[model samples]
Target chain A: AMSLGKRLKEARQKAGYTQKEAAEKLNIGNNNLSNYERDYRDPDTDTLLKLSNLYNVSTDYLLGK
Target chain B: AMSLGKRLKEARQKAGYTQKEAAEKLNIGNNNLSNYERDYRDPDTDTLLKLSNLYNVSTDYLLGK
Candidate 1:
């Protein structure tokens, strides 16, 4: 199973969002987003919704369909 | 829009898992699960994954489709 952390990474890859850019957008700092990408910690549900909107993806696609 | 908490409650209604059964299933306490379902706090990514599996719904549907 793909980890939620790894999926965040995969999403970023499709995004043109560098860690700095993405983090600066909202809901995180680079440090926190980095940790999330690395699977070091999990972002909260609200944060996931924000990320989902920014990515133009429904929350469903990010985790699994 | 449906809240994460509301959606969780929705899912649970269709499920036989009461607060006790749902919380004990894994990754939560009844108190904490109640909080999550109430939107008092958010579940972590790992916790969501566990919930998703138990419900046989993907994380996407849990958040939004």
Candidate 2:
């Protein structure tokens, strides 16, 4: 659980994104991305797909799902 | 297909929320809600639950499920 957690934070930052910027790009809010990066909430499948598409990263890379 | 679309838009407005505001509260973006309201996308269960809590409407009412 923690491992996937670390990867999410790392990959997101590695992609050169700030929470607000990435959220805007993904059509999600900055606060949500804040929580997501902080592991406060989980993105559901649809959000996950959008996130994947936005970052050009695979869902597997993000969620390990 | 269309009924849920209508309900989503209605509940969102009835909640005194604009698409941008609702998206921010839900930690999603404004455009996403617009798309959702327009029936261009569907929110997943987690987002649905959050929407239910946000609007004080039941998931059944939102989705007619």
Candidate 3:
């Protein structure tokens, strides 16, 4: 199964947003977003929804289901 | 939108497991499970996966996607 971090990275790139840009838009620390994209930490459901909306993907896809 | 807690409760009952039984199976405290089912607390990804597998449902459905 693909890791959530890898999926998040792919989604961000596909959305044409750099890490810094995406983090700023999400109102999260860049390092925190980096940690999430690296699978060092997982986002909660609320954060997942934010990413889903930002990336125009479903949370199901983000969860790798 | 339907809450994750409601979805979890519906799934648990659909699987024919009471809160205590489900909590035991998940190796979490009954109160914790109750909290989750009540939306008072959110489960992390690992716990979500455990519940998904236990309930024979996809994480997407558990997430209410």
User: Top model by TM-score, which number?
Assistant: 3
Misplaced by over 4 Å in model 2 are: A1-65
- Fraction of true contacts kept, per model? 0.82, 0.14, 0.32
TM-score of chain A of each: 0.83, 0.76, 0.95
Better of 2 and 3 by lDDT: 3
Listed in order, the DockQ scores are: 0.59, 0.08, 0.46
Model 1 pairs in collision = A60-B60
Which order, best to worst by DockQ? Answer: 1, 3, 2
Residue-level lDDT of model 3, residues A1-65, one tens digit each, is: 47989889999999999999999999999999999998999899778778878988876677766
Model 3 regions more than 4 Å off: none
Taking the tens digit of each residue's C-alpha lDDT, what string does model 2 give over A1-65? 55444666677778888777888888787788777767777766556556656666665555442
Candidate 2 or 3, higher TM-score?
3
TM-score of 3: 0.83
Look at candidate 3 and give me any clashing residue pairs.
none
Candidate number with the higher TM-score (1 or 2): 1
Query: Whole-model Cα lDDT per candidate?
Result: 0.77, 0.70, 0.87
**Tens-place lDDT digits, model 2, residues B1-65:** 55555888899889899878888988988887777778777776456667777888765566543
- lDDT winner among the candidates? 3
The C-alpha TM-scores of every prediction are: 0.79, 0.48, 0.83
